[PDB]
Amino acid sequence: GVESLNVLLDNRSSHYEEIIASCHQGINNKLTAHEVKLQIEEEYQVFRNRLRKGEITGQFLKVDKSRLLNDFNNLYVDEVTATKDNIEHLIYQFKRASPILRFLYANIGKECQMQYWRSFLNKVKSLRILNTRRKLLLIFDALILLASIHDQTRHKCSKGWLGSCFISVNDRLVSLESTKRDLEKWVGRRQQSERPPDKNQILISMFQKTILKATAALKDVGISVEHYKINMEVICPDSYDLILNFDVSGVVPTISYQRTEDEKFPFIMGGVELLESTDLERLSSLSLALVNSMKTSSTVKLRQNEFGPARYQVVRCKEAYCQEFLLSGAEFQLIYQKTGECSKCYAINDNRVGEICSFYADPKRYFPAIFSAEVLQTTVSTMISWVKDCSELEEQLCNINSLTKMILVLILAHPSKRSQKLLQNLRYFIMAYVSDYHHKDLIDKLREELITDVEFLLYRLVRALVNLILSEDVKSMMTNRFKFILNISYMCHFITKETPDRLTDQIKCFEKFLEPKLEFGHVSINPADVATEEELDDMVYNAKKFLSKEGCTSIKGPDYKKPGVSKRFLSLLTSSFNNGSLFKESEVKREIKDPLVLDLASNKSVVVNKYTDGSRVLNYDFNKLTALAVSQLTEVFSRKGKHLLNKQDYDYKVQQAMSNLVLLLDGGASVYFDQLKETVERIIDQYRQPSVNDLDEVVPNKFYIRLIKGELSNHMVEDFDYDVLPGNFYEEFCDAVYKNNKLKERYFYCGTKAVATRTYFDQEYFQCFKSILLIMNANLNFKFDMGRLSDDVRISERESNSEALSKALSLTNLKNLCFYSQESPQSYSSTGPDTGRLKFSLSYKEQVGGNRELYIGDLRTKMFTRLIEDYFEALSLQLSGSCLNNEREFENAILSMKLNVSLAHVSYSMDHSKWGPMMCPFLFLATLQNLIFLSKDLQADIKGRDYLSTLLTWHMHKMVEIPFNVVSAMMKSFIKAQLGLKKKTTQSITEDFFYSNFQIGVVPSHVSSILDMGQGILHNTSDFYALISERFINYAISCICGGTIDAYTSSDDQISLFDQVLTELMQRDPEEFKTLIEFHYYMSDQLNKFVSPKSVIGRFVAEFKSRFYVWGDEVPLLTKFVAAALHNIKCKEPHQLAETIDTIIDQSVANGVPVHLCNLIQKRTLSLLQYARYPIDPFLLNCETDVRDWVDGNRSYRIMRQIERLIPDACGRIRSMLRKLYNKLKTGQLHEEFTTNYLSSEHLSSLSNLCELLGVEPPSESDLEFSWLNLAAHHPLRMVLRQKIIYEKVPTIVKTIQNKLSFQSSIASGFVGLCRTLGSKCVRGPNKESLYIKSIQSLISDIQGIEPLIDSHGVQYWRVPLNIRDGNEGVISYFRPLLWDYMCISLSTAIELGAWVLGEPKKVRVLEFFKHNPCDYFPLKPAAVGLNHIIHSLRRLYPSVFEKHILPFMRIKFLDLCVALDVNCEALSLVSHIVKWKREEHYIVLSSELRLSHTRTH
RNA sequence: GCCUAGGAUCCAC
RNA sequence: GCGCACCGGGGAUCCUAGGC
Ligand SMILES: [Mn+2]
């Protein structure tokens, strides 16, 4: 099902023929195996001659450790003017490098009424009851202050104060004097305006009105105020005088916005040792308060707190937000003034001092250190323990430890971007160090453009550590030190994957995308859907030029790192592929056959175009773009730049003129100014259905509308809470909507609207209400509509793959979506299909270091790309060598690399530079128009090649969309530079390219060139080309020398193992081996494969897709996995976060990470949950695992281990029964009596009957009472919206099958959302309700027979006697009989894994201690279904679920038992875990920890 | 400019 | 003390009516 082009018209006229005849000009794909050898010998002779003479550069250098170390030392010798640094001096100046670091190592160190009043007012404000219009927060602060006054007069509860400021309702920290003066002014002005009443009276009345309105609104939605233990006695008849006469003396908090001198730090600088963990604990608390600084709602402000430019100097705190955090003997307040995630200025303040240190920061970057105060210490301890027995270093081990700790603390404190590329490039350095040859242009690629002082200090520390490890007299254990330095390098993963700045990264990415095209020689700009003849001529010219490359037979010789491919070498490659020369013997037998003889359902944000007429828009509108740019600069100046400058400034007057235009003459700017004026005037004149505002047409009480909006924004429509509104309001709203003919016909079907009609007529008032909401839900004065303008300038629109795919499927009525459909093309042209030329859209992934760009096309583009991808994949599958998809080939490559390193043979661990942009679809078209697969069959191969040619032709003429952000930024920069503001006179090539089109009209929207291959688009075609070219290169090398090479590659990589011949050659004659490597480089360049300067040749290591291998030992990437586990949390249900962390940690332990650290990672995750006020269930995580629990067991085995650890002596009498039960089920006794009489029956009364059915003693009466609290027992928790989702008690297995058959937030924002959910009515009642977790805790504490129990790790489980099992069935419904769930899971694993798990576990205690070195590994294999196997076996035990859930989503003798044993489980994934996530089959563990893992004998 | 009544904004994005 | 494509981020009030 590939060839389907015969349904369309060809229309290939005089252009496709030209491109075809281009790649047949000077190419001879018929050379025999002898002419090819002769030409290769000639080329090699000429190359060796011209390399000895010196007409060609060296390009490779033999490794000299001394020279490499010297270059790394003098890598940054223009600012770091030094060579050797004293370790003590480095330590000394580390603890003073920055505010955060100064604070980390400094020498520092009641149930009152104010808390009640503050919580009450916070709840009142959260509901958005009272419209803040005239200093409402002022009387809020007045109430809080009165509460505090009464409180202190009672017993002097000196909390909630900061010397002279107190914490207000939301989070605000207001000063006493300022609010006192404000109350004075307000009472005075009010008394004057209303003038008889005393000031005390006029204040108490103002308090009473607000309190009365708040209490009345609260006693309307069942939030009765008696819950909050408030006391309205605090409103004393003598209060105003009590306030004005109250005064607390202390300090005044401050925030410093400028770089303060290093003497105002009120504590001793360095007292904390690096060995201790107190610095990590301080960083943990500070990072926690910094992430919490994002949960503050953006309330209005009372006072301006400063005036004029002094508002960016040292600023006193009269009204600012404040987050508290404690340090082990004291408390501190992180004070700030802005709310959100954007970068802002914080300041730490104490109670006995003020403004300890202020610093700018970005809150959503400090997550990796939240509770990892003991994980990181153990990481450093293990890394030090690696190189600990090296006798050349034992004299100065403490310095190595100090440097490692300092590097970690530093990268955690300041997670800057360019402080990550340094630690990344350290890997390439240490790789080239131990090798034998490397690229001469290496050091010029390790240099990162460092900026701040902290980055230079980090470089200094790294340099000291390197020169301490890789010395010239430490030739003891190179493998351990290599692994140590590699892990130090991989420490870069501890920073973040995110981007510090969106626009700057998206512009650097566009510069990377645009520069090579401009430097190549030609670029088409703003192409039309019907390509112009000149554009076709330029494409043909660029085509004929792309083959014009030459080298080593010319005057100038070769020119390296320039895109293109020589006709001679392309002809050699095609001929050698047609002569069977590039065919191993295991492939000439099975002759190569041409491959001509829901699926996209994802969340890739596929693109979709806009249509203004019959044609679609392909160019931004110049006038609209400049209008939007000016509209942006207006908000930038008014909202922000107002309190920044004076008014006599030229730039200020120009910006204010532009603002008045939206809301000089002697420089040539008045002309352009009036042009912009008339343009924006035309735009404003040109800019002069159901929705949310329809709620205004229905609900009279605006407060109810505010509640509805708050719900809709906090939670999705589906989990809308019932008790947020009065019951009668639902029916009233439904009636009022249905009566309004307009809204009735806009939301109901009188002929989803059908569902609204049904639910209304059925009197399902809440259902009708939620349906209506779902249909609906889907500052400065502007003289026009700003949002429609902003959304009209854009050209493309993103969405989900599934949405557009379903729309296309509905419009059809894989290949069925692009050829047989109502919106199908008729006559594909030369450029592209009849629909129009292919179109992509630039993006970029978030990758450590640099960021690769991802192309995104619309549906037709994705389909036509997938056709070529599948064709070339099925083609490459016949040939051996590629490892992009074939996992078996990758494992073979790993085995070959291991064998090669074991023999100390030469290994070339290559990599290619700019593989994406340099490759081009024309190259693939040329290399495809010359191969012949089927030597005999020459009938259908021609048709297949013609089809693939006509597809690659379209892919050649593709047009890439320039992102809207970068074009807007360039337009604003152009406007500014036209005004003359900030003349730079540099004008990088990108800016020149943009301006050259801006100042002549048209704006660059779509760019098309012959040069770029979509990075990640043709990922398999490029892989096939790389395979077929590397095979020819190795064939040439074998033809010249007398050795062989075995190469593996996945589309950008190369691991080339050399035979013994090449190794002994490099041993004897270094010159010949070097010129061979150089000729290999030359060849790879001649075929458009530019070897990257990050490639090495050595006999010590071998990397492939970041999988290093040394002799004997194996190198784990400890810090990589630890950093991947530290920040890997989301805003999801806790039993899913736990499963994700468990999978991550399993993958980790399968790669050499010790378990003593994985336990600490799990403890950190549990602490992160405990902080969010969530109870810990036994089915969450087992933080006491061993080695066996990851190699033998699986997800559900460590759970059994944990439960056994919780309740010993009770699970034993259950395994005793389970052994006999498994024996009976395996011999084939019943196999159905159990699966029906006990799996579809009661729980405990059935459990005792089941265990007495066999010949074992039933459990004691005081064992069935052990139960665990299962929140979400009726319905899963309602999660607060952190991502817009694109468009009964269902068992978890059913939802897993649904997921398989078919814009999120950052990590820190996700953790904030998680902490916001748990504590905001997340649980759901039996039928439909909402309760706080604390309310359920209270309801459980009421019953004086329920006993809680907690383990040392903090796992909760309860003891509920049997007499309480009834009567009060409102809460007991949430408990589950732990023992029975343990039995169920144990049985579900005993038939998943072997029957061993039912044995009696015993710890190996007869084993004495061995002298365990921290580096000696042990390889192990795990102790060893499908999708339709489950779905064809589920309609037998629960056919109603099929008829209800799984039907529209379209034999094993024991799967029918397991697939039902997990349905009634509803406690943990049992078969879902093996159907959704594949277990790894190769583990590398510590041979010392295996000595302590338990034994589970049958 | 100030005061009063009402309307708008008052998780993160 | 953030970002560091030299361009960004770093303090929230607004509207209608009436009275002085
Ligand atoms: Mn590689």
Collapse the DSSP code of A1097 into the 3-class scheme (helix H, G, I; strand E, B; otherwise coil) and give the result. strand
**Closest to A765 (Cα-Cα) out of A736, A789, A730:** A730
Sheet strand arrangement including A1266-1269:
A1347-1350, A1356-1359, A1266-1269, A1375-1376
The 3-state secondary structure of A1414-1453, one letter per residue: CCCEEEECCCCCCCHHHHCCCCCCCHHHHHHHHHHHCCCC
**Nearest residue to A1355 (alpha-carbon basis) of A1195, A1177, A1135:** A1177
The DSSP symbol for A753 reads H
Which residue type does A494 have?
A: F
Strands A839-841 and A959-961: parallel
What's the order of all strands across the beta sheet hosting A1006-1008?
A524-525, A1006-1008, A959-961, A839-841
SS3 A1495: strand
How big is chain A, counted in residues? Answer: 1498
Distance A1313 CA to C6 C1' (A): 37
Q: Give the determination technique.
A: cryo-EM
Helix orientation angle between A418-434 and A453-469, rounded to the nearest 10 degrees: 20
DSSP for residue A6: G
Rounded Cα distance between A1495 and A1498, Å, is 10
- Which residues have C-beta within 8 Å of that of residue A1068, sequence separation ≥ 6? none
Which nucleotide minimizes the distance between its C1' and the CA of A355? Answer: C1
Burial group, residue A981, by CB count within 10 angstroms (0-12, 13-18, 19+) = middle
User: Which candidate, A487, A485, A344, A494, places its Cα nearest to that of A420?
Assistant: A494
Of A995, A964, A974, residue with least CA distance to A676: A974
Rounded to 5°, the CA angle A420-A425-A426 comes to 100
Cβ of residue A989 near strand B, that is under 7 Å? no
Pairwise CA distance, residues A326 & A339, whole Å: 22
Radius of gyration of chain A (CA): 36
CA atoms lying within 13 Å on the CB side of residue A1015? 18
Question: Which nucleotide lies nearest residue A966, CA to C1'?
Answer: C5
Strands (DSSP E) contained in A27-123 are 60-62
Structure tokens at A1319: 């504590």
Classified as helix, coil or strand, A346 is: strand
For residue A911, say whether it is annotated as part of any ligand binding site. yes
Dihedral sign, Cα of residue A1395, residue A1400, residue A1405, residue A1406 = negative
What are the distances in angstroms from CA A1233 to CA A1214, A1217, A1238, A1249, A1253?
Answer: 19, 16, 8, 13, 11
Q: Which helix (H) or strand (E) holds A172?
A: strand A172-175
Partners of A606 in the beta sheet?
A799
Buried/exposed A62-91: b ≥16 CB within 10 Å, e otherwise: ebeeeebbeebbebbeeebeeeeeebeebb
Do A284 and A373 form a contact (C-beta atoms < 8 A)?
yes
Backbone angles phi, psi at A542, to 5 degrees: -60, -35
Return all residues near A1209 (Cβ < 8 A) that are at least 6 apart: none
Cα–Cα distance measured from residue A1256 to residue A1235, given in angstroms and rounded to the nearest whole number: 20
d(CA A1391, CA A1382): 14
DSSP string, A394-456: GGGHHHHHHHHHHHHHHHHHS--SHHHHHHHHHHHHHHHHHSSEEETT-HHHH-----SHHHH
Taking each helix axis as running N to C, give the angle between helix A765-776 and helix A727-739, from 0 to 180 degrees, rounded to the nearest 10. Answer: 60
**How far, in Å, CA of A922 to CA of A19, rounded?**
9
Nearest residue, CA→C1' of B13: A1305
Residue A1212 CA to residue A901 CA, distance in Å, equals: 49
Residues A1306, A1311, A1313: CA angle, nearest 5 degrees: 90
For chain A, the domains span 1-61+497-615+798-962+1006-1094, 87-106+255-495+1115-1119, 113-250, 622-688+963-1004, 692-778, 1128-1492
Please, which positions of strand C sit below 7 A from a protein CB? 1-15, 19-20
The answer to the question of whether A477 is labelled as a binding residue is no
How many C-beta atoms surround the C-beta of residue A557 within 10 A?
18
Phi, psi dihedrals of residue A359, rounded to the nearest 5° = -165, 145
Q: At what angle do helices A278-292 and A1307-1317 cross, to 10 degrees?
A: 70
How many alpha carbons fall within 13 Å on the CB side of residue A444? 5
What does the buried/exposed string (b/e) look like for A1364-1390 if buried means 16 or more CB atoms within 10 Å of the residue's CB? Answer: bbeeeeebbebbbbbbbbbbbbbbbbb
Other CB atoms within a 10 A radius of the CB of residue A1480 amount to: 15
Beta carbons within 8 Å of A149's beta carbon, 6+ residues apart: A234, A242, A243, A246
- Resolution of the deposited coordinates, in angstroms? 3.3
Determine the Cα–Cα distance for residues A451 and A1018; give it in Å rounded to an integer.
Answer: 37
- A1094 CA → ligand 1 middle, Å: 9
Give CA separation, A1113 vs A480, A543, A1132, A1486, in Å. Answer: 9, 50, 40, 12
Alpha helices (H) along A1263-1398? 1292-1301, 1307-1317, 1333-1342, 1378-1390
- In the reported structure, the alpha carbon of residue A429 is separated from the centroid of ligand 1 by a whole-number distance in angstroms of 14
- Least Cα distance to A602 among A796, A820, A804 occurs for A804
Instruction: For residue A384, count CB atoms less than 10 angstroms from its CB and return exposed for 0-12, middle for 13-18, buried for 19 or more.
Output: middle
Quick one: three-class SS letters along A490-548? HHHHHCCCCCCCHHHHHHHHHHHHHHHHHHHCCCEECCCCCCCHHHHHHHHHHHHHHCE
User: Is A318 marked as a binding-site residue?
Assistant: no
| Residue A348 DSSP SS3 | strand
CA of A909 to the centre of ligand 1 (A): 6
Residue A1055 bridge partners (DSSP): A909, A1048
Q: How far is CA A982 from CA A636, A974, A988, in A?
A: 16, 11, 15
Tell me the residue type at A665.
Answer: L
The one-letter amino acid code at A1158 reads C
> Contact A146/A232 with Cβ under 8 angstroms?
no
How far apart (Å, rounded) are the C-alpha atoms in residues A1274 and A310?
A: 58
Q: How far is the CA of A48 from the centre of ligand 1 (A)?
A: 28
Are the C-beta atoms of A600 and A801 separated by less than 8 Å?
yes
Contacts (Cβ under 8 Å, ≥6 apart) of A153: none
DSSP H helical ranges for A1059-1117: 1060-1068, 1070-1086
The Cα A534–Cα A590 span in angstroms is: 47
Three-state SS annotation for A250-267? CCCCEECCCCCCCCCCCC
**What CA–CA distance (Å, rounded) separates A88 from A85?**
9
**Do the beta carbons of residue A1223 and residue A1498 sit within 8 Å?**
no
Q: Three-class SS of residue A1177?
A: coil
Report the alpha-carbon distance of residue A1466 to residue A1381 in Å, rounded: 9
A1062 and A414 Cβ atoms separated by less than 8 Å: no
Q: Which amino acid is at A811?
A: L
d(C-alpha A560, C-alpha A566), whole Å: 12
SS3 A799: strand
Write the CA distances from A694 to A690, A710, A714, A746, A1192, integer angstroms. Answer: 7, 16, 20, 10, 60
Q: Are A256 and A355 in contact, with CB atoms under 8 Å apart?
A: yes
At residue A315, φ and ψ (nearest 5 deg) are: -120, 125
Of the candidates A1402, A1349, A1342, the residue with the CA atom closest to the CA atom of residue A1371:
A1342
Residues 629-668 of A with CB under 7 A from strand B: none
Task: State yes or no: A1103 annotated in a binding site.
Answer: yes
- H or E segment and range at residue A690: none
Q: What are phi and psi of A717, to 5 degrees?
A: -65, -30
CA distance A695 to A57: 75
Q: Which residues pair with A1484 in a beta bridge?
A: A1419
Interatomic CA distance for residues A1194 and A1189, integer angstroms: 7
DSSP designation for A827: B
* Calpha distance A1136→A1129 (Å, rounded): 10
